[PDB]
Amino acid sequence: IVGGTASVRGEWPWQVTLHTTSPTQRHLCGGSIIGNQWILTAAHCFYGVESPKILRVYSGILNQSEIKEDTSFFGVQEIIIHDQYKMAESGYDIALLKLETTVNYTDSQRPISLPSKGDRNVIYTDCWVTGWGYRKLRDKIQNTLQKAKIPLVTNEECQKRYRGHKITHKMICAGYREGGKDACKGDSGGPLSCKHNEVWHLVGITSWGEGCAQRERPGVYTNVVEYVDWILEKTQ
Ligand SMILES: CC[C@@H](C(=O)Nc1ccc(C(N)=O)c(F)c1)n1cc(OC)c(-c2cc(Cl)ccc2-n2cc(C(F)(F)F)nn2)cc1=O
């Protein structure tokens, strides 16, 4: 996250850190708890992941330094990638992880609601991007979960910024005209979380941008409301 600040214990309890264990254990991507046994994340996270066996899902983490050889984690039973996914920059950047067991919800591990049937025309004005990503282009994974508030931009404006890409109704963009706040390397897969009537909704999945927090270069997110029928199909 560029231009963000440290989160506190319990602030983003749907946020997970997805780790690979091959050839060494490291943070790969963010993700979101959407159900007892379900993480929503980005399909691109699984590039060169040989199988679900090398994945670990850590919930209730504020600082990556908490993760030690005795820290409990969820095994991944199945990675479900959208069947139209080819690469982040061409969309369908969405995946479910089915966990090997159900999360007991606590103050530090809670689900986030999907966008609600009836709110397709809600204008979300309180959206946050979170993650352990770089805080500028040339950086490293951060210890402490970072947060940043970011305004949604019109698809029409987003497409004008990315005329070499298909900015579709299945994408949503967020960014300041003069940049300074954005997702960056290591934040992908995690949530764009918008609060509406004091209820948080998973509006976006961090997917891509050209650069991090450049002017007139909004981040691009998978538009979760456009995949609610797919999510429900796979999870039910
Ligand atoms: C796998 C792709 C992933 C990534 O780089 N992951 C990653 C994880 C771990 C390490 C490590 N050191 O251990 C690492 F080096 C890289 N990714 C790609 C993006 O976009 C490619 C974005 C992005 C998303 C928005 Cl909404 C806005 C702008 C960006 N952005 C753009 C860039 C760029 F251009 F500088 F590469 N970096 N982040 C975020 C993002 O996490």
Q: What kind of sheet is the major sheet?
A: 8 strands, antiparallel
H/E element sequence: EEEEEEEEEEHEEEEH
Strand content: 25-35%
What percent of the residues sit in helical stretches (DSSP H or I)?
A: under 10%
Distance between the termini: 33 Å
Number of strands: 14
Overall geometry comes to globular
Question: In the CATH hierarchy, what is the superfamily of the largest domain?
Answer: Trypsin-like serine proteases
Tally the helices: what do you get? 2
The protein's oligomeric status is monomer
Strand order of the largest sheet: 1-9-8-12-13-14-11-10
Bound molecules: the ligand CC[C@@H](C(=O)Nc1ccc(C(N)=O)c(F)c1)n1cc(OC)c(-c2cc(Cl)ccc2-n2cc(C(F)(F)F)nn2)cc1=O
Number of domains: 2
> CATH topology of the largest domain, what is it called?
Thrombin, subunit H
Tell me what the CATH architecture of the largest domain is. Answer: Beta Barrel
Q: Report the structural category.
A: mainly beta
The CATH class of the largest domain is identified as Mainly Beta
Radius of gyration: 16 Å
Report on the structure:
With 236 residues, the chain is mostly beta strands. The protein folds into two domains: 1-12 and 112-226, Trypsin-like serine proteases (Thrombin, subunit H), CATH 2.40.10.10; 13-111 and 227-236, Beta Barrel (Thrombin, subunit H), CATH 2.40.10.10. The protein has two helices and 14 strands. The strands form two sheets. An eight-stranded antiparallel β-sheet has the order 1-9-8-12-13-14-11-10. A six-stranded antiparallel β-sheet has the order 5-2-3-4-7-6, covered by helices on one side. Strand 3 (26-35) and strand 4 (38-41) form a beta hairpin. The protein is globular, with a radius of gyration of 16 Å. Bound molecules: the ligand CC[C@@H](C(=O)Nc1ccc(C(N)=O)c(F)c1)n1cc(OC)c(-c2cc(Cl)ccc2-n2cc(C(F)(F)F)nn2)cc1=O. This is Coagulation factor XIa light chain.
